[PDB]
Amino acid sequence: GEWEIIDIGPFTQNLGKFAVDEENKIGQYGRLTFNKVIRPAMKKTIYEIKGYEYQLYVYASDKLFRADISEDYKTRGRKLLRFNGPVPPP
């Protein structure tokens, strides 16, 4: 696949919210409150397209985490791949 840097507009913020919502279902960090996604946001496109992956820096409950998210082209399904941290600011 190929990687590009993307903006941190509303669509990206909603991916961050997705990630925190999914991590809350897992419960590994306890209950987290989504704050914001910060730069840099990275997007991978996997080939007709199979899907996408995102690597995001997400503040939740005033702590910084790294979240990876997949998105399937044909099913539109999103999945949280991993959620790690706290991490230092980029």
Author numbering: 1 to 47, 52 to 94
Copy text from the publication.
Single-chain monellin (SCM) is an engineered protein that links the two chains of monellin, a naturally sweet-tasting protein. However, this substitution may destabilize SCM because Cys41 is buried in the hydrophobic core of the protein.
Furthermore, under all three different pH conditions the relative order of the Tm values of the SCM mutants was the same; that is, C41A > C41V > WT > C41S > C41L. In the SCM C41A and C41V mutants, the main chain structures around the 41st residue were found to be almost identical to those of WT SCM and the C41S mutant. The superior thermal stability observed after substitution with Ala or Val may therefore be attributed to the absence of their side-chain deprotonation, which can decrease thermal stability, as well as their interactions with surrounding residues.
